Write a structure and sequence with these properties.
part of a larger assembly, 10 chains, A mainly alpha, B mainly alpha, C mainly alpha, D mainly alpha, E alpha+beta, F mainly alpha, G mainly alpha, H mainly alpha, I alpha+beta, E: alpha+beta, four-stranded antiparallel β-sheet, three-stranded antiparallel β-sheet, 18% helix, I: alpha+beta, 25% helix, flat, binds cardiolipin, binds 1,2-diacyl-SN-glycero-3-phosphocholine, binds heme C, binds protoporphyrin IX containing FE, heme (chain H), respiratory chain (chain H), electron transport (chain H), Cytochrome c1, heme protein (chain H), mitochondrion (chain H)
Chain lengths: 40, 360, 88, 77, 328, 96, 60, 243, 73, 18
């Protein structure tokens, strides 16, 4: 917002949301899908 | 610096209805100061050599005046550090303190990470079986990157070099703690504390007479309880197996970390992929960090009242607490299929109820 | 860390004198064992059952260490109530 | 608890609405007409970091504005 | 402050001109002064008696508002999702609210019969008040309910004792327990720097004197310190005894016969009385010389020159045999 | 902290440093008020606590029933059922 | 309260803070030692015939 | 693997909060340890200094220490020698190194007992149970030579032979000897040896906790003293109600 | 004599606050009455508007002096 | 020294401008 000094927490917000999407994608690939393809 | 003392700890004005649940910060600070005193006086007689560390700790107990007292106070006050921190965290999950105390909440998380590191480094210094094999496990856990583990160890395996640098690091970190505490309090008093009612009120009252006495009362209780447990040994907080000298080629037949590490241990028991293991810790900590800017994740204007009193729905924080306790229970037990099954149930609950805090 | 942990409301026995100075050249446990043996009869029952079934099955693998362990844990947990009355 | 005869009212009346809507209008127009770019400033001058703040010493790197004297307050300038 | 607002467009949350979460019925006045009148003409629910929870008036707004996965709280009022360029027109016939954007970017305030300057004057936010406002909104007279106890039932009145003694006795008691505990802590901490229980410094030893030769000095270990045993020559004895005539001049006068109960045997603690160094062979008086600051001792142990304040200290000793000695 | 329109003072005397926090949190007394207090040397101070004990305790315990105890009971249930499952497993897998 | 007020402890020992401190220190000093010796006696009373002093060793 | 059972709780004199150790039992336990258990175990942390005044009189302890040859040196020729033990020396040990200990005990290592009750679950109750625990094998199980069945040792098979035998030792106070009595007395002795500072610790604890509790009462009163002045305050809006 | 406060908070009457504080005194006929008459004078009075010829910052009365030098204003 | 650092927030000030 205009007239405010908080400028570094928004960046961390976007980085964190990014990182969680990342982690969940990789976890689905690692723990579920790759084994599943051995059971498919 | 006296004028600051008066501005922040004497004339500072609080809300009338701050009950005991707002006294636990002061308490963790006090356990810090106390742990520092006993630390320094333990360092004067400790030996940082793999050949003789163990007997160095035994010499304090056997042949030194009041030798036993400082070791046992230091050992027992750690448990209270962690217990007070967990109460202190849960209070602010319950109240949604992080709605406006954004940077304070971030600082809190950093302090908790510091405390975990400090405790675990301490846990290796007496140099028994549990110490050696715990260090082995946690160093293998951060293996994904080449050469980082032999470098941090100092060596191809846990060694006297490792002991020396763990001792120095355990010396240093608490004081960095203290600096971050000053930072913490800066962010806090920039805003001002919340009520249990979560309203804004003008019925304020100064600190020195009313709230200082409650701080003192709780302080008396805590000093009491620490000495009770320290002198008489009511609870088996620490497992016996650190009482055995180290053997590099034989593990102990039964394994139980310190209680404040059991939940983590439970995860490492039940998730198949080791990287999945580590990623669960990383993800949960990232989720907690994300709460600092919860006001942005939605366009409805936010309130701090969670209306958990009389509520049949309860609240996600309570489910989180019970899931965590269940994980401690399962942590403690042997590896068996049924324990693992209920482990995985509890783990899913623990992860989901943390994710869901953002969905108002 | 501690050698032991305190127990609340423990009951401390008075030393029952032996009726004959020679009476405790033989282990007092022998005088408490019968009663407890009678109290843990269900474990004896199950151990004998398993013994029979193991001897019968004929595929040549089997054992009854479980039920044996339970039997003797029962007997010991019974004996522990009175053994210290007979020791100084 | 209060007596039950003190509790005979409807708590969910919306008495703030006409004012919240006006506030939203007024604070939206300022974003539109002033906040549309990432403006550039002088760093660590005037008690403000320079990246956008307009109240002195609200951030850690601009804490402790004085070393001597009696200080002061922003509201009395 | 350090806190942003979050006015932005949103696709999960429609604007409040589209979907208000509050109950959208408001009365409107030509001038806010008129709101005075209603406060002295309406009835109020808090002026009337009820006795059971089941008699409390029922809320006007519906329970069924907010939906979605994992949403505990089902009721809200206000949101800051942003308005479009052309807002939805309020229908004043249904008593809907007209405020901010919907006054500026809408024709709502228009009336055929009236000047525009007069017409716009009725759409300030003070001219609107919800339905039920005068009947339900509380306005306390005190923080204290008449059904609870205040100081009047606890005040100590005429006839009462003085309690200053009791108060200050209470706090003095607290403090003297506190001080005892603090002193105990400091005493334990001091004691913890003291020497350990394994050391004890106890012991005694014996020495066989057959192998020694005249003019030789032997050295032995005793209670952590060195001890010299010397088989003096006749000339060493004579050197010691010649300086008995100059005892006047010495810093620590003593005669040789005391220091050598057997004249040919000299025994001392091997340590400089100045600051603890170990004297070496030689010096100006055929005795010993300390290299750390330059003290000299004679052939009997006596301090002749330098900063050391006393002679070499005699250990507690006994001759067991003609040829054996006991230390300690 | 407080909004700028609340922390605007009427006086003009310089705020002393030891009062910083006091005037950062200034708030207006809209409508004014009257208050009375008695010196604690002229009050009873342990009888007022017990005199109002039952009301306070009813309130506190009522507030916590559903949110804390009912999930607690469910969790205790789950532990008991887990124990059942384990004590049956240990015989199925290893007893003949 | 009338009894306590009659002892005039406040007038002489607690109304002036220097004397308040003197009182605190001295009462500490004496009370601590009395408490200690009393607990010593209890520890000997409960444990009679179990401690080292109560059952001398007799040489063979 | 399996969850091992939990021992029963025996009423040892010390496991109350107000009780000390029971010194006659400690003397008898020490005698048992010397005559039996010191054949294969060690207590490297114990010195005879520890027994004087706490368990035994000094004279007797010196005479005990004199029974052993203890190695010392070097001498003037740089050779080592043997001398009679003194009050300052640690307890002797039966094997020169772990390898020899394993060589004499079929591969297993007899642990050092200097902290044994603090190095096991349920401590003295476990040790008391273990010494009782030797029994014949169950149906369907057989153990290889030099291995024994015990119902309280984890996994039930243990390398230590049956430990106790009636009148294998004798007492100087006159008490009759049997395996149960020896069990009680040696467990008492080892529990003491695990931390001789126990009684000091507990007696200090009592004073500390009592005084701190009295403190707590006083501070509670002081806190309520200030609670009551604002809990009972009156605030009125508009006009004065009561006075 | 009761030790209590009675405060009327009001922010719509300008910048000035008025206060009075009281202690328990002695009767007309008490021996110490005169001493009380003297103590009242030892503490004395002050006005910022009208001051005589002695500046408050140098006055012989220490209470006036301490009040007039606070924060230099 | 014991009256150093008069403020923790804000812009400070100077004695000469009171
Ligand atoms: C095993 C599996 C699990 C793994 C773990 C997974 C964990 C996941 C969850 C993560 C949780 C959150 C982590 C932190 C996120 C921070 C995000 C952020 O930027 O927030 C912005 C936010 C403010 O943003 P804003 O509102 O937009 O305000 C705009 C302002 O302009 C902004 O200015 P301002 O003045 O208002 O703000 C203060 C300013 C300025 O602050 C200061 O000047 C304070 C300086 C204090 C120094 C004291 C010594 C500290 C030494 C490091 C200790 C690390 C301990 C780590 C714990 C584990 C130990 C093993 O600091 C910042 O802005 C933050 C800078 C980044 C902080 C990073 C902290 C973490 C890493 C630090 C260590 C890095 C590794 C190398 C060194 C390791 C040595 C052990 O700031 C905070 O909330 C920060 C709170 C304080 C916490 C950090 C305190 C330490 C500061 C260290 C600074 C770097 C130097 C390090 C030492 C190097 C030489 C040795
Ligand atoms: C102690 C400090 C030393 C003193 C000196 C100060 C040092 C700081 C210098 C670095 C800053 C250079 C960039 C200049 C930007 C100028 C923009 C402008 O016109 O200003 C207005 C503009 C704010 O006006 P506004 O747009 O009206 O405000 C609305 C909000 O910003 C909300 O806007 P929104 O929500 O619409 O989103 C806008 C957002 C949209 O974009 C995003 O949100 C993208 C998110 C994607 C995720 C990926 C992460 C993005 C962050 C990149 C970080 C990489 C840098 C580190 C590289 C390490 C290399 C070793 O825009 C950006 O993110 C663009 C700016 C990003 C730049 C951040 C990195 C700049 C550092 C470059 C030098 C790196 C060398 C460092 C060496 C190692 C030591 C640190 O300024 C900013 O946004 C500030 C950005 C820079 C961060 C603040 C600087 C830190 C100050 C605190 C010191 C903490 C030190 C802790 C250590 C303590 C030791 C003890
Ligand atoms: C190789 C093998 C392969 C095997 C494959 C097998 C695959 C099986 C998959 C099963 C999937 C089941 C779920 C189907 C969902 C269908 C959704 C749908 O059709 O949506 C249409 C439609 C979507 O439209 P919409 O616009 O979203 O409207 C819906 C609203 O948004 C809704 O919002 P609203 O406002 O209308 O409602 C209020 C709202 C808000 O309500 C609340 O907030 C109330 C909360 C009250 C909580 C009180 C708790 C107090 C007690 C605490 C006790 C302590 C516990 C903690 C401590 C314990 C110790 C650790 O309610 C909810 O949020 C309800 C949440 C229900 C969660 C159910 C979760 C089921 C999980 C099943 C397991 C899945 C796998 C797990 C992970 C595996 C590993 C990755 O939704 C509906 O019409 C509503 C349907 C709702 C259905 C819920 C009940 C489902 C029952 C499924 C039974 C499955 C049995 C499986 C047996 C398997 C045997 C092998
Ligand atoms: C400067 C370093 C000092 C270190 C202190 C250690 C000293 C030795 C051990 C204690 C000795 C006994 C105490 C001194 C005597 C009492 C002082 C005195 O004169 O009383 C003045 C006064 C006594 O007031 P009073 O009202 O009781 O009586 C005075 C009035 N007359 C004379 C009329 C009776 O004490 C106070 O008012 C102190 C206010 C605080 C009270 C509560 C304190 C409890 C602790 C709070 C938290 C502690 C954590 C913070 C510490 C940081 C480190 C962790
Ligand atoms: C040589 C014949 C021994 C004598 C005499 C005693 N012990 Fe021992 N002990 C010995 C061996 C070879 C072992 C190894 C057992 C194994 O399974 O590896 C042990 C072991 C113990 C233990 C450990 C128990 C455990 O659960 O780990 C204890 C507590 C123990 N022994 C105690 C003990 C006592 C009290 C003795 C005197 C009565 C004693 N032992 C004698 C060898 C020998
Ligand atoms: C928050 C602060 C601290 C915490 C939480 C902490 C935690 C711990 C823990 C858990 C142990 C294990 C003790 C045991 O297992 O018996 C330990 C041991 C130790 N700590 Fe720390 N510690 C802190 C501060 C310090 C400081 C400041 C120092 C020194 C300056 C220090 C020095 C030591 C030493 C020497 C040991 C070894 C104890 C032993 O060998 O018996 N500690 N610490
Ligand atoms: C060494 C560790 C810590 C110390 C010394 C500490 C200290 C304090 C103190 C003294 C307070 C004010 C009084 C009180 O609340 O008790 C406080 C408040 C607070 N702390 Fe901590 N804290 C620590 C850890 C944490 C952690 C781990 C978190 C969060 C994960 C946290 C978040 C908060 C919040 C949100 C508040 C204010 C809550 C509110 O005002 O409603 N702190 N802290
Ligand atoms: C019950 O309700 C409350 C209790 C509270 N208790 C306390 C103890 C404080 C507090 C802590 C520290 C402080 O200043 C300090 C910072 C850092 C230091 O450094 C270190 F390491 F702690 F010593 C010391 C000192 C100033 C104030 C509060 O604000 C506080 C607020 C509320 Cl609402
Ligand atoms: O197998 C383990 C094990 O898994 C851990 C674990 C417990 C959790 C610890 C931990 C996990 C996460 C964090 Cl953020 C901090 C500590 C890491 C070591 C131990 O502590 C341990 C100690 C001794 C022997 C074996 C073991
Ligand atoms: S130490 Fe010998 S002369 Fe100084």
């Amino acid at each position: 917002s205009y007239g405010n000094g908080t400028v570094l927490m928004p960046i961390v917000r976007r980085v964190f949301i990014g990182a969680l999407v990342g982690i969940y994608a990789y976890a689905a690939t690692d723990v579920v899908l790759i084994p599943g393809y051995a059971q498919l | 610096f006296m004028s600051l003392f008066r501005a922040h700890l004497v004339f500072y004005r609080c809300a009338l209805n701050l009950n005991s649940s707002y006294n636990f910060g002061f308490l963790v600070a006090m356990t810090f100061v106390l742990q520092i005193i006993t630390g320094i006086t333990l360092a004067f007689r400790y030996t940082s050599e793999a050949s003789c560390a163990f007997a160095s700790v035994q010499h304090l107990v056997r042949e030194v005046a009041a030798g036993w007292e400082f070791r046992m106070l230091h050992a027992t006050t750690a448990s209270f550090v962690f217990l007070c921190i967990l109460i202190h965290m849960t209070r602010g999950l319950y109240n949604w303190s992080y709605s406006y105390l954004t940077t304070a909440w971030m600082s809190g998380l950093v302090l908790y990470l510091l405390t975990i590191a400090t405790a675990f480094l301490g846990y290796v210094l007496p140099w028994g079986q549990m110490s050696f094999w715990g260090a082995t496990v946690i160093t293998n856990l951060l293996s994904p990157i080449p050469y980082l583990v032999p470098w941090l160890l100092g060596g191809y395996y846990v060694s006297d070099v490792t002991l020396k640098r763990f001792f120095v690091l355990h010396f240093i970190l608490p004081f960095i703690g203290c600096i971050i505490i000053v930072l913490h309090i800066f962010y806090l008093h920039l805003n001002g504390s919340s009520n249990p009612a979560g309203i804004d009120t003008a019925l304020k009252v100064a600190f020195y007479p009313h709230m200082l006495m409650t701080d003192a009362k709780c302080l008396s209780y805590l000093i009491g309880l620490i000495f009770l447990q320290a002198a008489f040994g009511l609870m088996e907080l620490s497992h016996p197996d650190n009482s055995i000298p180290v053997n590099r080629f034989v593990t102990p037949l039964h394994i139980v970390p310190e209680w404040y590490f059991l939940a983590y241990y439970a995860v490492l028991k039940v998730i198949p992929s080791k990287t999945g293991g580590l990623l669960v810790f990383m993800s949960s900590l990232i989720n907690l960090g994300l709460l600092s800017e919860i006001r942005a994740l939605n366009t409805r204007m936010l309130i701090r009242q969670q209306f958990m009193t009389r509520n049949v729905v309860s609240g996600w924080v309570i489910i989180w607490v019970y899931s965590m306790i269940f994980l401690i229970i399962i942590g403690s037990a042997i590896p068996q299929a049924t324990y693992i099954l209920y482990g995985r149930l509890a783990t899913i609950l623990y992860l989901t109820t943390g994710l869901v805090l953002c969905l108002y | 860390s501690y050698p032991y942990y305190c127990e609340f409301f423990v009951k401390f026995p008075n030393y029952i004198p032996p009726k004959d100075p020679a009476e405790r050249l033989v282990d007092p446990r022998q005088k408490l064992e019968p009663g407890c043996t009678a109290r843990c009869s269900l474990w004896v029952n199950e151990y004998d059952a398993c013994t029979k079934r193991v001897r019968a099955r004929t595929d040549n693998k089997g054992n009854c260490s479980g039920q044996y362990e339970e039997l003797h844990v029962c007997i010991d947990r019974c004996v522990a109530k009175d053994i210290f009355k007979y020791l100084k | 608890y209060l007596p039950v005869h003190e509790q005979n009212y409807d708590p969910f009346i919306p008495y703030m609405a006409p004012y919240v809507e006006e506030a939203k209008f007024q604070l939206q127009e300022e974003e539109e007409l002033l906040g549309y770019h990432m403006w550039e400033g002088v760093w660590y001058s005037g008690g403000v970091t320079g990246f956008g703040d307009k109240e002195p010493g609200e951030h850690f790197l601009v804490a402790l504005p004085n070393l001597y004297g009696a200080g002061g307050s922003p509201m009395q300038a | 402050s350090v806190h942003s607002h979050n006015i932005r467009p949103d696709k999960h949350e429609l604007p409040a001109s589209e979907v208000p979460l509050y109950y959208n019925r408001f009365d409107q006045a030509d001038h806010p002064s008129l709101w005075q009148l209603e406060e002295e003409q309406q009835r109020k629910h808090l002026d009337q008696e009820v006795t059971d929870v089941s008699q409390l008036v029922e809320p006007v707004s519906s329970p069924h508002q907010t939906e979605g996965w994992f949403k505990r709280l089902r009721y809200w009022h206000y949101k800051e999702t942003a308005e479009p360029t052309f807002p939805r027109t309020p229908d004043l016939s249904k008593g809907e609210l007209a405020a901010g954007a919907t006054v500026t970017r809408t024709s709502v305030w228009h009336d055929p019969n009236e000047p525009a300057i007069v017409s716009v004057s009725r759409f300030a936010p003070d001219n609107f008040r919800a339905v039920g406002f005068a009947e339900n909104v509380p306005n306390p007279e005190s923080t204290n309910s008449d059904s609870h106890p205040d100081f009047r039932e606890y005040r100590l009145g005429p006839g009462s004792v003085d309690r200053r003694p009791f108060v200050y006795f209470m706090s003095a008691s607290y403090f003297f327990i506190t001080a005892s505990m603090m002193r105990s802590f400091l005493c334990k901490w001091v004691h913890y720097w003291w020497v350990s229980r394994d050391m004890l410094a106890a012991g005694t030893t014996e020495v066989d004197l057959r192998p020694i030769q005249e003019g030789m000095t032997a050295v032995f270990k005793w209670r952590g310190k060195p001890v010299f045993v010397r088989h003096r020559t006749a000339e060493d004895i004579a050197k010691a005894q010649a300086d008995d005539a100059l005892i006047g001049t010495m810093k620590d006068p003593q005669l040789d016969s005391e220091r050598c109960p057997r004249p040919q045997w000299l025994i001392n603690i091997g340590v400089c009385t100045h600051l603890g160094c170990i004297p070496t062979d030689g010096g100006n008086y055929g005795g010993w010389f300390c290299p750390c600051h330059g003290s000299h001792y004679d052939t009997s142990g006596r301090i002749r020159l330098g900063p050391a304040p006393s002679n070499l200290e005699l250990p507690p000793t006994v001759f067991l045999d003609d040829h054996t000695v006991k230390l300690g | 902290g407080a909004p700028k329109f609340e922390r605007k003072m009427l006086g003009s005397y310089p705020v002393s440093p030891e009062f910083e926090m006091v005037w950062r949190d200034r708030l207006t007394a809209h409508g004014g008020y009257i208050q009375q207090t008695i010196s604690p040397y002229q009050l009873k101070f342990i009888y007022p606590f017990w005199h109002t004990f039952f009301a306070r305790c009813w309130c506190k315990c009522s507030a916590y029933a559903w949110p804390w105890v009912w999930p607690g009971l469910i969790t205790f249930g789950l532990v008991k059922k887990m124990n059942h499952d384990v004590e049956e497993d240990i015989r199925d897998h290893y007893w003949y | 309260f009338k009894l306590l007020n009659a002892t005039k402890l406040y007038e002489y020992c607690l109304k002036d803070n220097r004397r308040y401190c003197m009182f605190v220190m001295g009462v500490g000093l004496v009370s601590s030692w009395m408490w200690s010796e009393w607990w010593n006696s209890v520890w000997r009373r409960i444990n009679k015939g179990k401690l080292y002093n109560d059952v001398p060793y007799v040489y063979p | 693997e399996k969850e091992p059972p939990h021992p029963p709780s025996y009423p040892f004199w010390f496991k109350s909060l107000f009780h000390s150790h029971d010194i006659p039992s400690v003397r008898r336990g020490y005698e048992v340890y010397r005559k039996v258990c010191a054949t294969c175990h060690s207590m490297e942390q114990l010195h005879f200094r520890h027994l004087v005044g706490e368990v035994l009189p000094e004279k007797r302890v010196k005479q005990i220490a004199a029974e052993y040859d203890v190695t010392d040196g070097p001498n003037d020729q740089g050779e080592m020698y043997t001398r009679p033990g003194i009050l300052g020396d640690a307890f002797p040990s039966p094997y020169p190194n772990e390898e020899a200990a394993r060589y004499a005990n079929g591969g297993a290592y007899p642990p050092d007992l200097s902290l044994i009750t603090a190095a096991r679950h349920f401590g003295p109750d476990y040790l008391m149970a273990l010494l009782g625990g030797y029994r014949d094998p169950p149906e369907g199980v057989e153990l290889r030579p030099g291995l024994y069945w015990n119902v309280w040792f984890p996994g039930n098979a243990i390398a230590m032979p049956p430990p106790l035998m009636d009148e294998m030792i004798d007492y100087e106070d006159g008490t009759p000897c049997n395996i149960s009595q020896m069990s009680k007395d040696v467990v008492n002795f080892l529990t003491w040896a695990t931390e001789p500072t126990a009684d000091e610790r507990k007696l200090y604890g009592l004073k500390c906790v009592s005084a701190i509790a009295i403190g707590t009462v006083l501070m509670t009163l002081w806190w309520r003293f200030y609670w009551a002045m604002y809990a009972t305050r009156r605030i009125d809006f508009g006009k004065l109600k009561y006075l | 004599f009761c030790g209590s406060e009675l405060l009327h908070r009001n922010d719509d009457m300008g910048p000035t606050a008025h206060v009075a504080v009281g202690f328990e005194g002695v009767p007309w006929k008490s021996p110490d009455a005169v001493t009380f008459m003297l103590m009242q004078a030892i503490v004395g009075s002050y006005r910022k508007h009208d001051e005589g010829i002695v500046p408050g910052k140098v006055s012989a009365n220490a209470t006036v002096r301490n009040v007039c030098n606070k924060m230099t204003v």
